[PDB]
Amino acid sequence: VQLVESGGGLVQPGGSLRLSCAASDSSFYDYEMSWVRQAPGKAQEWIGSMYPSGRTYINPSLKSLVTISRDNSKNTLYLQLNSLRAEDTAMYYCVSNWASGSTGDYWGQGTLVTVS
Amino acid sequence: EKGIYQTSNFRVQPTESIVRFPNITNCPFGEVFNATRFASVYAWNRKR
Ligand SMILES: *[C@@H]1O[C@H](CO)[C@@H](O)[C@H](O)[C@H]1NC(C)=O
């Protein structure tokens, strides 16, 4: 095992939550490590992205809802969920290289998330 | 006059022509076009 995820669970509507993903080495984060969600029913979408040039530009539709930060001590990666409603059932995977199409993304096992 | 005279030549003209080439006429070009999603227009890929 070289990458893991930590945090998450039941989401009381209007409550706060913590989520994370990890990596193995500093070269693994090089150069891009972007957050991504998936969802049963709702289309898959990428959560956050940290570009290697120092400038971070989240999606114009997803740049005002998620805060993204990186901690390399555990290789952890803070993620928070706020005010989920009954229409946002999402299942979270930590998959890299989504700005490369479906030819560079890495698929493992991930975790299954249900939001009621 | 009497004698044996050579007039012309005659060749057996060739019938239908053929061409033969080997096996193993292939790489998976589908893996380029049958990708589920394409990337951003600032990340053009050269799948060599
Ligand atoms: C790509 O996927 C479609 C499935 O509808 C298939 O018909 C097509 O033959 C595939 N292309 C190649 C080169 O395999």
**Which residue is it, tokens 């009497």?**
B2
Question: Is A101's Cβ below 8 Å from some Cβ in B?
Answer: yes
Q: Is B26 in the pocket of ligand 1 (CB under 6 A)?
A: no
Helix (H) or strand (E) holding A99: none
Q: How many residues does this entry show for chain A?
A: 116
Q: State this model's resolution in angstroms.
A: 3.5
Task: Give the amino acid at A113.
Answer: V
Give the mutation target among B27, B32, B33, B34 for probing the ligand 1 site: most ligand atoms within 8 A of CB: B34
Q: Whose CA is nearest to atom 3 of ligand 1?
A: B34
Rounded Cα–Cα distance for residues A48 and A101 (Å): 16
Give the chain B residue nearest A97 (alpha carbons): B39
Find, among A15, A2, A23, the residue nearest to A75 by Cα: A23
Alpha-carbon A2 to chain mean position: 17
Pair A3, A24: CB distance under 8 Å = yes
**A residues 41-100 near B, CB within 8 Å?**
99-100
What DSSP assignment string belongs to A11-79? --TT----EEE--S-HHHHSS-----BB-SSSPPB------TTS-----TTTTTT-------SS----B
Find, among A27, A36, A40, the residue nearest to A96 by Cα: A36
Q: Whose CA is nearest to atom 6 of ligand 1?
A: B34
Pair A90, A82: CB distance under 8 Å = no
For residue B4, list its beta bridge partners.
none
Rounded Cα–Cα distance for residues A7 and A86 (Å): 21
Rounded Cα–Cα distance for residues A100 and B38 (Å): 7
Rounded Cα–Cα distance for residues A79 and A61 (Å): 17
Question: Is B44's Cβ below 8 Å from some Cβ in A?
Answer: no
